[PDB]
Design an enzyme around this catalytic site. Structure first.
Site, PDB file in Angstrom:
ATOM      1  N   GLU B  71     -13.673   6.810 -54.393  1.00 52.38           N
ATOM      2  CA  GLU B  71     -13.389   5.597 -54.943  1.00 52.38           C
ATOM      3  C   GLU B  71     -12.255   4.568 -54.181  1.00 52.38           C
ATOM      4  OE1 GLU B  71      -9.894   5.833 -56.014  1.00 52.38           O
ATOM      5  OE2 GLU B  71      -9.562   7.400 -57.645  1.00 52.38           O
ATOM      6  N   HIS B 100     -11.406   0.204 -65.165  1.00 49.07           N
ATOM      7  CA  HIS B 100     -10.786   1.551 -64.853  1.00 49.07           C
ATOM      8  C   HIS B 100     -11.547   2.673 -65.509  1.00 49.07           C
ATOM      9  CE1 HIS B 100      -6.545   3.071 -64.399  1.00 49.07           C
ATOM     10  NE2 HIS B 100      -7.402   3.854 -63.609  1.00 49.07           N
TER      11      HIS B 100
END
Lengths: 108, 108, 108
Positions: B71, B100
């Site tokens: 990520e 998130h």
């Protein structure tokens, strides 16, 4: 430099690695960065702090026997907590403060 | 009160000391302030966190043998980290999330 | 969900409890949130950090025997400290920096 969804996605497809403006958590930490745990949104999205006892040691709120005061954050979305609070008593009087308990206004 | 470049510069020239709204680091600390180390911009201007392993324990991203997910933060400038992340696999699939890691959208 | 002064006040009067988007400090802490002490506005509203010694180890500011340099934050209101600083010497020369000591401009 490159930090948008499409800018990063295209760079990854072409170069197979992140742009030069990215560093891992380890690297950031090696440099002195310590992730803050102070943003309530990270652990509890959509929530706000509220329900705790307000001592009223200053006495700006009307006191009475058996009456306890509580508070709750107002206008909070994410990041640092602000100075807006709503104060409510056990017998339901409601006050507000926008300067972190310096002054109060009765609103109900 | 006085906190602009020209306002402070003129006050310094006239009074030879900072305005009454300034306090040293020691004084601030004596009052309970502890400088945060959570703003990445302080130690590494122009950089963003990215390149770390995303476990995918939830399994919302397509799994495969030998495929690892990573990520990277998106839209970060300074201050607290946000909820925007770009996910990329070892074999180059690209997804995005703006909440998130709650939901993902394939973008390439 | 409900986090405005009037929205919360009405909910409290009707249900006698805070909306479901509120959690106490204990609950937040149980979840991993630790209140930050990095926002100067919390302990000292209206103040800014300033008056400390700037070493000038890099030597971008003119040096001289007996001259010491000091700094002060500019444009600070609340939250994280920025990159704006005003530098002043013991003999009153004034410089500014907007990139956290990378470059300086003489302003007086």
């Amino acid at each position: 430099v490159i930090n948008t969804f499409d800018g990063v996605a295209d760079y990854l497809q072409t170069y197979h690695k992140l742009p030069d403006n990215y560093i891992t958590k380890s690297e950031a930490q090696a440099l002195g960065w310590v992730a803050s745990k102070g943003n309530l949104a990270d652990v509890a999205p959509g929530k706000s702090i509220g329900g705790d006892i307000f001592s009223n040691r200053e006495g700006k709120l009307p006191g009475k026997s058996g009456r306890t005061w509580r508070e709750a954050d107002i206008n909070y979305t994410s990041g640092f907590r602000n100075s807006d609070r709503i104060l409510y008593s056990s017998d339901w009087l409601i006050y507000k403060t926008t300067d972190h308990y310096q002054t109060f206004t009765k609103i109900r």
